[PDB]
Structure 1
Amino acid sequence: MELHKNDIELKKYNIGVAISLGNKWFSIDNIEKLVKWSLLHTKEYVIIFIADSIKLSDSHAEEVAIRYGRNLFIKIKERVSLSFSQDEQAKIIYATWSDIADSKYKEKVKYLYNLYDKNINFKNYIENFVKEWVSKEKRTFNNNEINKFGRYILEELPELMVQVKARGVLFEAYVYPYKTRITEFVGLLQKGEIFPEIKTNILDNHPKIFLEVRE
């Protein structure tokens, strides 16, 4: 389990652990190893959060948090309390959707929602985006569901792009085991190489760092 550079060996940043809920790779064992790696390399804290999940709430991420994210965090806490010392455990923050999506955050999501509604090229790009995943799965989806899926992506985009606080703790970098279409898209957005109005409106010269860490 290592990083696929000297700022990490110099422990410059706090490190988020981005979890894809229900993705086959994110067994409790693999999550535990990502947490182990992050604790060894972090400036101080490790922030565990749910990055995606590919009517009890107006927000999809919030509904994921309450139906499933809480039971996931509980299992992670238990495993951690058996695997790590008490001093290590104290450095872990379990950041729920609520912890992350404060007032500043939701403004950035709202800018993206408004762009999704008013810019046909953005909408079409984000929707096409969703169809690539669903064309891998065996299940099929209709348009209204593809369109809603695209909105759920936008809710989570800022926490992969902008340095946000979780319970007042800034994390400048996060770990994820593989490059995805999402991480590629984010990297283009942060450089202004795609939909440059997004960088202009909600991004801020302090880009979140993506660390590719796996076995």
Structure 2
Amino acid sequence: MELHKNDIELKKYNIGVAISLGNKWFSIDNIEKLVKWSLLHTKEYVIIYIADSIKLSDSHAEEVAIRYGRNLFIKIKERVSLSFSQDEQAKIIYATWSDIADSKYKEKVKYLYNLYDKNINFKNYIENFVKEWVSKEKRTFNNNEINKFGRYILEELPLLMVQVKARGVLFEAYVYPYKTRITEFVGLLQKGEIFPEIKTNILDNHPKIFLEVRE
């Protein structure tokens, strides 16, 4: 695959690999490709995490992590240790939800939850957002479910917008195989062009960089 940028082939950034569990593209082979591309283009490290899902925990991301991410990561570790040299393997960091969701990240999430409960324009935008995603799924969903799906998005939204640390490692950039409704929405947020209060409250002027990489 290849980037769809001079800072990259100058290896300026660390690169996160955001895996959407359940999205048919993220087979184990496509995941291996994305990791190989990131090891070749990263400044030093590649961070691998589970990034959405388009009760054993109070957080949906945490629940996904312990129910699925553990076994996914185990399959990824096996494949990697058979595809990559041992020194290349040194560059990789498997970041669970807890690695990312430090206390500083949680305040940003709290700000979004708060805003989801108090700003009905925001509430309705986020929910219509879920409503559109799922109106191409054959299955249907009620409004309480639609509303619960919305909070799940808000839980991942800071990661998409700001540069954060996982196990003490800043990663400025992340790879994803195509543009999505979400990536356009995040773009607008970072520019302050939609719900600008969000930019003012949770973006510290170092925006997460989205790199589109596909075959």
TM-score band (shorter)? Answer: over 0.9
TM-score (norm 1): 0.99
Q: Within 1, Cα distance between the matches of 2:194 and 2:92?
A: 34
1:46 aligns with 2:46: yes
Displacement of 1:5: 1.0
Displacement of 1:55: 1.1
Percent identity over the alignment is 99
* Misfit runs of 4+, over 4 Å: none
Q: Within 2, Cα distance between the matches of 1:172 and 1:138?
A: 36
For residues 93-117 of structure 1, give each alpha carbon's deviation from its aligned partner in whole angstroms, at most 9, with x where no partner exists. 0011000000000000000000000
Which position in structure 2 is the counterpart of 1:119? Answer: 119
* SS in structure 2 of the partner of residue 136 of structure 1: coil
Displacement of 1:92: 0.2
Q: Within 2, Cα distance between the matches of 1:66 and 1:30?
A: 22
Displacement of 1:54: 1.3
Displacement of 1:186: 0.3
Q: Within 2, Cα distance between the matches of 1:58 and 1:108?
A: 17
Q: Within 2, Cα distance between the matches of 1:203 and 1:143?
A: 30
Q: Within 2, Cα distance between the matches of 1:41 and 1:93?
A: 15
Which position in structure 1 is the counterpart of 2:146? Answer: 146
For residues 132-189 of structure 1, give each alpha carbon's deviation from its aligned partner in whole angstroms, at most 9, with x where no partner exists. 1110100000000000000000000111111100000000000000100010000000
For residues 189-211 of structure 1, give each alpha carbon's deviation from its aligned partner in whole angstroms, at most 9, with x where no partner exists. 00000000000000011001000
Q: Within 1, Cα distance between the matches of 2:161 and 2:51?
A: 12
Q: Within 2, Cα distance between the matches of 1:26 and 1:92?
A: 18
Would you say how many aligned residue pairs link Structure 1 and Structure 2?
A: 215
Q: Within 1, Cα distance between the matches of 2:127 and 2:35?
A: 33
Q: Within 2, Cα distance between the matches of 1:19 and 1:179?
A: 14
* SS in structure 1 of the partner of residue 49 of structure 2: strand
Which position in structure 2 is the counterpart of 1:201? Answer: 201
Which position in structure 2 is the counterpart of 1:93? Answer: 93
For residues 52-107 of structure 1, give each alpha carbon's deviation from its aligned partner in whole angstroms, at most 9, with x where no partner exists. 11111000000000000111011000000000000000100001100000000000
Which position in structure 2 is the counterpart of 1:33? Answer: 33
Displacement of 1:51: 1.1
Which position in structure 2 is the counterpart of 1:157? Answer: 157
For residues 12-42 of structure 1, give each alpha carbon's deviation from its aligned partner in whole angstroms, at most 9, with x where no partner exists. 0000001101100000000000000000000
* SS in structure 1 of the partner of residue 135 of structure 2: helix
For structure 2, list consecutive stretches of 5 or more residues without a partner in the other structure: none
Q: Within 1, Cα distance between the matches of 2:133 and 2:186?
A: 17
Q: Within 2, Cα distance between the matches of 1:159 and 1:72?
A: 20
